Amino acid sequence: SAWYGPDRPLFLGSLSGEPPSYLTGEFPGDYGWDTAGFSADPTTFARYRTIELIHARWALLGALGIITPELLAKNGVPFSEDGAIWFKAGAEIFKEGGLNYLGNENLIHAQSILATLAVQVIVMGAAEGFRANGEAPGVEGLDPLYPGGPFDPLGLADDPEAFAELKVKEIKNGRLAMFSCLGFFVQAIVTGKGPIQNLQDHLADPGVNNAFASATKFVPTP
Amino acid sequence: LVLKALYFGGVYDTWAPGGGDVRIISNPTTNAAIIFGYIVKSPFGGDGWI
Amino acid sequence: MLTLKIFVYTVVTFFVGLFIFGFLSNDPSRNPGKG
Amino acid sequence: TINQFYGPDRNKWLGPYSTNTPPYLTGEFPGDYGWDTAGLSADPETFKRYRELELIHARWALLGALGMVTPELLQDDDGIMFGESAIWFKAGAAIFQEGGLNYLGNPSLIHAQNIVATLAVQVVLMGLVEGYRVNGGPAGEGLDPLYPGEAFDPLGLADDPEAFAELKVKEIKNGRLAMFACLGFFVQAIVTGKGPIENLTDHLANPAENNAFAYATKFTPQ
Amino acid sequence: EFYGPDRAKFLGPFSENDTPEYLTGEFPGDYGWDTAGLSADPQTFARYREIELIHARWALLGALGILTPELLSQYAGVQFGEPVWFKAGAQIFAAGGLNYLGNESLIHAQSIIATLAVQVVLMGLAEAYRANGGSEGFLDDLDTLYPGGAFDPLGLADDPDTFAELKVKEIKNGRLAMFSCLGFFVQAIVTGKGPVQNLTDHLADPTVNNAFASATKFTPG
Amino acid sequence: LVDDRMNGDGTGLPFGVNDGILGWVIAGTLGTIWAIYFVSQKDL
Amino acid sequence: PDLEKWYGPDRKLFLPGGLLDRDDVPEYLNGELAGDYGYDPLGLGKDEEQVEKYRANELLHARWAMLAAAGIIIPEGLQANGADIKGGTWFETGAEMLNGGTLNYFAVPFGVVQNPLPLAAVTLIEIVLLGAVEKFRVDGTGPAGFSPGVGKFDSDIFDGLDKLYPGGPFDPLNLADDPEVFAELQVKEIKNGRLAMIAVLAFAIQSYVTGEGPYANITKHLSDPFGYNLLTVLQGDDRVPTL
Ligand code: CHL
Ligand code: CHL
Ligand code: CHL
Ligand code: CHL
Ligand code: CLA
Ligand code: CLA
Ligand SMILES: CC1=C[C@H](O)CC(C)(C)[C@H]1/C=C/C(C)=C/C=C/C(C)=C/C=C/C=C(C)/C=C/C=C(C)/C=C/C1=C(C)C[C@H](O)CC1(C)C
Ligand SMILES: CC1=C[C@H](O)CC(C)(C)[C@H]1/C=C/C(C)=C/C=C/C(C)=C/C=C/C=C(C)/C=C/C=C(C)/C=C/C1=C(C)C[C@H](O)CC1(C)C
Ligand SMILES: CC1=C[C@H](O)CC(C)(C)[C@H]1/C=C/C(C)=C/C=C/C(C)=C/C=C/C=C(C)/C=C/C=C(C)/C=C/C1=C(C)C[C@H](O)CC1(C)C
C-alpha cells in the first residue's frame, strides 16, 4: 500500500506533518522519522542506512537465538541452569561439562573460550573484510548493502516490486528485532530473569507483575 | 453483569458454605490461562468444555 | 503409546489444515457460474 | 540593547578570548554564543533541528526543575502532608501508597491509585499534544515550530520585536540554566540519595566538608 | 605510506576501494576509518580532527601518568600513600595529605578546594588562550593545532617531510594511548586493582588470570 | 500400579495436550500448511 | 463548519422527521438563531423581535446556570471527598455564616483559606459590584480596563459591539473570528446552557425531595441503583415483602 514515494505511511500517522526533504521515500523503511537531522547529506545517510540494516539482521539473529534455547529448555531440552538464560549462557563454557549444544555431550562440548574467540575473530574478520570492500574470491560486483547472488540461493529477489516489498518487510522486522533486543537487554538488567520467564511471570498476574513492580529497586539510599 | 455481581448486591453462590447464599464477588479470577483453558478444553466427560 | 497420539494428532492437524486453508484458498472463485 | 546578543559584537562563550567562532554561527537565533567547537551543527538543517530540539529541551527542563524543587519546599515540619514523595526521585512510589498520591495533604485532590490508567491517559494526551506540535491542530495550523504565539500567547507580551528578541534570549538562557540544574539534580540523586533542597541545607550547614568531595570515593571498585 | 591514495589503511586490502572520498590522506592518521560517516562534512571533519588530537595528547600524558607511579612502587621500592591510580585522588583526604614522593616537604597538600580553584583558574586561562590562538598581538597567529612558536624550543619543527612523518607518529602514539586509557578505565571497574598488578597477575598464569575470569562479575541476579 | 498409563483424562488439558511435543506438532503442522498456502498466493 | 444541521431550513428539530414535518414549524423560526429546534408547543415566540428579546434572557439564564451547576456540584463533591469546606451543600451554604461563622474558601490546588468578611459586608460589595456590572450590560458602557485579548482598552470599545456577544475584552483567547466556528460554538453554548438550566432545576427539585445534595444523590445512586432512587426515597421507609 504505497510503501515508497511521497504518499508513504509516516511515523506519526495523520499528525506527522511535513517529512524532511532528504527523506523522499527512495529507500526501504522510510517513515519520515528524523527529528535530529542526522541524514542531512546523503553520504552519512548511506552509512547510517547500511549500519541500520546490518544491526537489523544481527538483531533478528540475536532475538531468535535469545528466545529459542530458553523455549527449548522450558519445553524439555536439558539446559541445566545457565544455558537457558542467555545472559548467563556465556558462563556455560566455564563449567566442567562445558558448552554443549542442546545439552548433548557428543555435540560441540567446548571448553577453550580462548580458541573459540580466536576462531570467531579470524572468521568474522575475513567475513567483515569481504563485506567492507565489496570484493570476495568468488564474487566481483554487487550492491554492497543488498548483495544477493550466493547470498540468495532460492532467488526470491527477482522482480523490483516483490524486491521492494520484501525489503520493507526486512527493515521493519529488523526494527522490531532491535526494539525487542533492547527490551531483552533492559529486562535482564532490571529483573535478572530471562525474557520468556518475564513473559510467563507477566501472564500469571499482569495487573501487579509488570514493569512498575521493579521501578523501586533502583532507588539510591543516603 | 460484572458490575451487578461486584458492587450491586452480588450473585447467588451455590458453592457458599451451608447451602449457598447471595455473595458479593471478591477477587474475580482474571488469569488468562485458567479463563481460556475452559475454551480450549475438550467437551467430553471430566472436562466438559465450558 | 505417546507416539501413536503424536501421529494421530499430526494427521488430524494436517487434514484440518488442508480443509481450513483450502476454504481460505479463494473458494468463491471456483464458481461455475457468472460472478 | 539588542546588539549584545544578536550581532558580530555579541556575547561569546569565552568572553574576550574567543575569536574563532564558527562562520555558520553568524548570530540570528536565541543564544548563539558561538559554542560549536565540536562542529555538530555544520549542516544548516541539522543546525535548525538541533536548535528546535534544544528549545524544546529547555522548555521541558524549566518545568522539570521547578517541579523537582516545589514539593520539597512545600514540605511541612512533621511531614504528614508528604511522605517519601516530597523528594522528587521517590515520588513515583506515591502512586503505590495505601491511598494513592494526593496533590497535597488533603485527600480530595487527584487521589489516583492506578499507575497503569494514569500512564495510559498521559501517553494518549501527550501523543496528541506532540502530534499537534509537529503538525498543527486546534491551537494552530501553519505557525512557527518554536514560536506560534497565537493560542500560546494570550497575555500579549510579545510586542516591539526588538524586545521580543531579548525575551527569546531570556527564555533560552533560563532554559539552559534549567537544564544545567536538572543535570545537577540527576547527578546529586545518583550519588547522595537526598533531595536537592536537603543537599542545599546540608551544604549551608557546613560548606567546608559537605560537598561532592564527601562522596568522591563512593564508586570506588573494591 | 601514511599519506596519499597509497596510504596504509585500517582494513588493509579490505579497505582499498571502500574508502570515504573526503578521507584523501592529506591529514595524518588517515587510515580511511569513517564507516559511520561522522565527518562527511569538511568543517565537522576539522573539528573532530582537533578533538582527536587534543585527546591524543591528553591521553599520552595520562597513560604516562597512571603507569609511572605504579612502576615506581614496583622495582626501586618508592613508597606512596596509595600507588593505585584510581585510589590516588583520595590521598588528600588522608591525615598526611598528598606528597609527591612521600616527602613531607615536597607537596603536603590538604586543601582540595584550593587546588581545584587554582587548577580551574590557571588552565581555564590556558584553554581560553588555546581556543583564541592569542589575543591582540601576543602569539596572535598559528593554526591552534600545530603552534610550534614558543612551543618547540628544540627546533624540531623543520624539514616538512619528517615533520609530517612525526605528525603521523604522534597521532598513532596518541591513538594507542587513548586505547590504553580506555583499557585502564575498563580494568579499574571490572577488577578494582592496579593495571600493572593486573599485568603481574596475568603473567603468573595467562590461562586463568584473564578478562574472561571476571566476565561473570556483572551478571544480574 | 501394575501398568503404565498416560492419565490424561479430565484436568482440562488444552487441546488434550499432555506433553509439549503434542502442541509443537500442532503448531508445526498448522504453520507449514499456512506457509505453503502463503507462498502459493497471487493465483487466479 | 458543519452548520447545515444547526442552521437553515433543514436542521435538527425537537422532533424527528416522522413526528414533525417542516410545515407546522412556526414561521418565525427559520434557523437563523443558535439552537433553533422549532420547539414551540405554546404560543410564546410571537415574532422575530419577541423571540430575540426572549433569547436575551435565555442566554443570560444559560450563562448563569452553567456557573450555578458547576458551583453546586464542585464544593459538595470536595467536601464529601475530604476537603475542609464546612458548607459544601448548596441549599444550606448560606445558613452556615449567619452569626459570623464565616465560610472557608478552597482555591485548588492550594486552597483551604478563611474568609474574614461578615455577611453584611459580602452582600453590600456584591450588590454594589453586580449592580454596576448589570448597568454596564444594559447600557454598553465601560470606563477603562485591561484584558489579555485587547490591551488597555479605552471606553470607546463597547460601542457598536454585538448585544449578548461582545467580542474583544470578553474574548481573550479569541477562537471566534471565523464566523462558521463562531456559529457552531454559539449552538454549543446555547445547548450547554439549556442542559445547565435543566440540571439546576433538577438540583433544586432533587434537594427538595431527598434533603441532600446532588453529589450525595449521584454517589448513593451509583452505590445502590435499585436500592436508592426516586421511588425508593418516595417509599418513606422500607417495604413489606410480597412473599
Ligand atoms: C553482542 C555480543 C555479546 C553480548 C551482548 C554479550 C553479553 C554477555 N556476555 Mg558474552 N556477550 C557477547 C559476546 C560474546 N561473549 C563471549 C564470551 C562470554 C563468556 C565466556 C562469558 C560471557 C558473559 C556475558 C554476560 C556478562 C554479564 C554482564 O555483563 O551483564 C550485564 C549486561 C547485560 C545483562 C547485557 C548488556 C546489553 C547491552 C548493555 C550491550 C550493548 C552492546 C555491547 C556494548 C556489546 C558491544 C559488542 C561489539 C563490540 C561488537 C553478558 C550478558 C559471561 C556470563 O555469562 O556471565 C554470567 C561469561 O562468562 N560472554 C564471546 C566469545 C565467544 C562473545 C563473542 O562475540
Ligand atoms: C574569561 C574566561 C572564560 C572561560 C575560561 C570560560 C570557560 C567556559 N565557559 Mg564561559 N568562559 C569564560 C568567559 C565567559 N563565558 C561567558 C558565558 C558562557 C556561557 C553562556 C556558557 C559558558 C560556558 C563555558 C564553558 C564551555 C566549555 C565547557 O563546557 O568545558 C567543559 C569544562 C571542563 C571539562 C572543565 C573540567 C574541570 C575539572 C577540574 C572538573 C572536575 C572533574 C572531575 C573531578 C571528574 C568527574 C568525572 C569522573 C569521576 C568520571 C567553559 C568551561 C558554557 C558552560 O558550560 O556553561 C555551564 C556556557 O553555556 N560561558 C561569558 C559571558 C559573555 C564570559 C565572559 O567573560
Ligand atoms: C523524564 C521522566 C522520568 C524520570 C526521569 C523518572 C524517574 C524516576 N521514576 Mg518515574 N520518571 C519519569 C517518568 C515517569 N515515571 C512514572 C511512574 C513512576 C513510578 C510509578 C515510579 C517511578 C519511579 C521513578 C524513579 C526510579 C528509581 C530511581 O531512583 O532510579 C534511578 C534514577 C535516578 C536516581 C534519577 C536520575 C535519572 C537520570 C540518570 C535519567 C535521565 C534520563 C531518563 C532515562 C529519561 C529518558 C527519556 C524518557 C522519556 C524515557 C526515578 C527517579 C519509582 C520511584 O520513585 O520509586 C521510589 C516508581 O515507583 N516512576 C511515569 C508514569 C506516570 C512517568 C511518565 O512520564
Ligand atoms: C580525566 C580526569 C579524571 C578521572 C578519569 C578521574 C577519576 C577518578 N577520580 Mg578524580 N578523576 C579525574 C580528575 C580529577 N579528580 C580530581 C580529584 C579527585 C578526588 C579528590 C578524588 C578523585 C577520585 C576519583 C575516582 C572516583 C572513584 C571511582 O572509582 O569512580 C568511578 C570510576 C570510574 C567509572 C572509572 C574512571 C572514570 C572514567 C569512566 C572516566 C571517563 C571520562 C570522564 C567522563 C571525564 C569527565 C570529566 C572531564 C570532562 C573533565 C576516579 C577513578 C576519588 C578517589 O580516588 O577515590 C578513591 C577521590 O577521592 N578525584 C581532580 C581535582 C584535583 C581532577 C582533575 O582536575
Ligand atoms: C548471531 C546470533 C546468535 C548468537 C551470537 C548465538 C549464540 C549461541 N547460541 Mg544460538 N541460535 C541463533 C543465533 C545465535 N546464537 C538462531 C538464529 C537460532 C535459531 C536457529 C539459534 C539456536 C540455538 C540453539 C538451539 C542453541 C543455541 C546455542 C548458542 C550458544 C552456544 C552455540 C554453540 O553451541 O556453538 C555453535 C553452534 C553451531 C555452530 C551450530 C550447531 C551445529 C550442531 C552441533 C549440529 C551439528 C551439525 C552436523 C550434524 C555436524 C557437523 C559435522 C562437521 C564435521 C562438518 C551461543 C552463546 C546453544 C545453547 O547452549 O543455548 C544457549 C543451543 O543449543 N542457539
Ligand atoms: C434498532 C434501533 C433503532 C435504530 C437503528 C433506529 C433508527 C432511526 N430511527 Mg428509530 N426507534 C427505535 C429504534 C431505532 N431507530 C425505537 C425502539 C423506537 C421507539 C421509541 C423508535 C422510534 C422512532 C421514531 C418515532 C422515529 C424514528 C426515526 C429513526 C431514523 C432517524 C431519526 C432518529 O434517529 O430518531 C431518534 C430516536 C430517538 C431520539 C429515541 C431515543 C433513542 C435514544 C438515543 C436511546 C438511547 C439508546 C440506549 C442504548 C438505550 C437502548 C435500549 C436497549 C437496551 C434496547 C433512524 C434511521 C425517525 C424516522 O423514522 O425518520 C422519519 C422517527 O420519526 N425512530
Ligand atoms: C531513527 C531515529 C531518528 C530520530 O530523529 C533520532 C534517533 C532517536 C537517533 C533515531 C532512533 C534511533 C534508535 C531507536 C536506535 C535504536 C537502536 C537499537 C535499539 C539497536 C539495538 C540493537 C540490538 C542488537 C543488534 C542486538 C543483538 C543481539 C545479539 C547479537 C544477541 C546475541 C546473543 C544471543 C543470540 C544469545 C546468546 O546466548 C548470547 C548473545 C551473544 C547475547
Ligand atoms: C553546546 C555544545 C557544543 C559543544 O561543542 C558540543 C556539546 C558538548 C555537545 C555541546 C553541549 C551540550 C550540552 C551542555 C548538553 C547538555 C544538555 C542537558 C544537560 C540537558 C538536560 C535536560 C534536562 C531535562 C530535560 C530535565 C527534565 C526534568 C524533568 C522532566 C523532571 C520531571 C519530574 C519532576 C518535575 C518531579 C517529579 O518528582 C519527577 C519527574 C516526573 C521526573
Ligand atoms: C574512528 C571511528 C570511526 C567509526 O566509523 C566511528 C567511531 C566508532 C566513532 C570511531 C571510533 C572512535 C573511537 C575508537 C573512540 C574512542 C576514543 C577514546 C578511547 C578516547 C579516550 C581518551 C582517553 C583519555 C583522553 C584519557 C586521559 C587520561 C587522563 C587525563 C588521566 C588522568 C589521571 C592521571 C594522569 C593521574 C591521576 O592519578 C588519575 C587520573 C586523573 C585518571
UniProtKB/TrEMBL annotation, chain B:
It is found in: Membrane; Plastid, Chloroplast thylakoid membrane. It comes from the Eukaryota. PSII is composed of 1 copy each of membrane proteins PsbA, PsbB, PsbC, PsbD, PsbE, PsbF, PsbH, PsbI, PsbJ, PsbK, PsbL, PsbM, PsbT, PsbX, PsbY, PsbZ, Ycf12, at least 3 peripheral proteins of the oxygen-evolving complex and a large number of cofactors. It forms dimeric complexes. Belongs to the PsbB/PsbC family. PsbC subfamily. One of the components of the core complex of photosystem II (PSII). It binds chlorophyll and helps catalyze the primary light-induced photochemical processes of PSII. PSII is a light-driven water:plastoquinone oxidoreductase, using light energy to abstract electrons from H(2)O, generating O(2) and a proton gradient subsequently used for ATP formation. This is Photosystem II CP43 reaction center protein. It comes from Dunaliella salina. The lineage of its organism: Eukaryota, Viridiplantae, Chlorophyta, core chlorophytes, Chlorophyceae. The gene is psbC. The chain holds residues 163 to 212 of 461 of the full protein.
From TrEMBL, chain C:
The chain crosses the membrane at residues 6-24. InterPro entries: PSII_PsbI (IPR003686), PSII_PsbI_sf (IPR037271). Keywords: Chloroplast, Membrane, Photosynthesis, Photosystem II, Plastid, Reaction center, Thylakoid, Transmembrane, Transmembrane helix. Its main location: membrane. The keyword RNA-binding does not apply. GO terms for cellular component: chloroplast thylakoid membrane; photosystem II reaction center. One of the components of the core complex of photosystem II (PSII), required for its stability and/or assembly. PSII is a light-driven water:plastoquinone oxidoreductase that uses light energy to abstract electrons from H(2)O, generating O(2) and a proton gradient subsequently used for ATP formation. It consists of a core antenna complex that captures photons, and an electron transfer chain that converts photonic excitation into a charge separation. This is Photosystem II reaction center protein I. It comes from Dunaliella salina. The lineage of its organism: Eukaryota, Viridiplantae, Chlorophyta, core chlorophytes, Chlorophyceae.
Automatic annotation (TrEMBL), chain E:
Keywords: Chlorophyll, Chloroplast, Chromophore, Photosynthesis, Photosystem I, Photosystem II, Plastid, Thylakoid. Transmembrane segments: none annotated. Chlorophyll b 1 binds at H55, R57, S111, Q119, E127, R130. Chlorophyll b 2 binds at G89, A90, Q119. Chlorophyll a 1 binds at residues 31-33, 39, 52, 55, 91, 101, 169-170, 173, 175, 187, 202, 211. GO terms for molecular function: chlorophyll binding. Gene3D superfamilies: Chlorophyll a/b binding protein domain. Chlorophyll a 6 binds at F218. The light-harvesting complex (LHC) functions as a light receptor, it captures and delivers excitation energy to photosystems with which it is closely associated. This is Chlorophyll a-b binding protein, chloroplastic. It is found in: Plastid, Chloroplast thylakoid membrane. Chlorophyll a 4 binds at K172, N173. InterPro entries: Chloro_AB-bd_pln, Chloroa_b-bind.
